[PDB]
Design a protein around this ligand. Sequence first.
Ligand SMILES: [Ca+2]
Ligand SMILES: [Ca+2]
Ligand SMILES: [Ca+2]
Length: 316
Amino acid sequence: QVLRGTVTDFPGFDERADAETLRKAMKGLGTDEESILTLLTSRSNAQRQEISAAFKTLFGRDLLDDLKSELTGKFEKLIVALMKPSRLYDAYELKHALKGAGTNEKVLTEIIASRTPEELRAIKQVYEEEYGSSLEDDVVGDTSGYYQRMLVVLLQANRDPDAGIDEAQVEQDAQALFQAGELKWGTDEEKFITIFGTRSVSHLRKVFDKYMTISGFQIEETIDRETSGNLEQLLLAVVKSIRSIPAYLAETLYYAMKGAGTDDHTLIRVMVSRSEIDLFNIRKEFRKNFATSLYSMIKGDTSGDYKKALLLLCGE
Ligand SMILES: [Ca+2]
Ligand SMILES: [Ca+2]
Ligand SMILES: [Ca+2]
């Protein structure tokens, strides 16, 4: 289970020639979108910043501000996503999502639950540097209920480390979840927040299997039968992530492409934020769990230059 991405540092890189290339495309009458998507999808996020710095030092124009004006549509949303630095991306998505009573809970659920504690320690700091208040403070403001209490548990980024499997704790946690689920009629949601948010990944992977043999249900089936709403999605999101993170994002991409139409914001977020992390593992678990390739479903659910950059980001 080696994590590798689909986009690496382009060999033979020049900050200035690529800046001059992106200039002529946007300069003049109209655009040359194929010259932009080929450049951006074949350059790493670290290289994309050196081109942005050389673009401003050469012409005195903001490369990001010139892309929003020259482009539009779904192609505009994907291009600016690749431009945002990896250090700023996850905080940028949580920023624009956490806003208002119509807060998109899926973006909060997908990012906070599938990111390692070390990944979230950098997210909380970057959120406070670029923006005003704290990520945790802005979460509880536009959130409530047990769904809020689970979000801040994960935001603490203090999960137990992997350092051995405890048979005694595995059997008692599996019983405590059973003694808070099917047996305890109703639901004691606080017991699920403590176990699913604190214990180590290796410990919970063995609690999931020990819970199955003492109850008969998988840990995912008890969650849905007892919980509903955003709390049900948060519990299932951490469980699928603890089992395998690339397997969870592969599910988030699969269900974003079928329905009445394409969830373009979700497909852009996952394919970009993991393009240099574990996107190859995502498409590996994608051909395994759904009997089709990511390159195929993007081919038939997207159009124009917007699908060209998505397929180059996939890599055949
Ligand atoms: Ca132009
Ligand atoms: Ca019950
Ligand atoms: Ca569809």
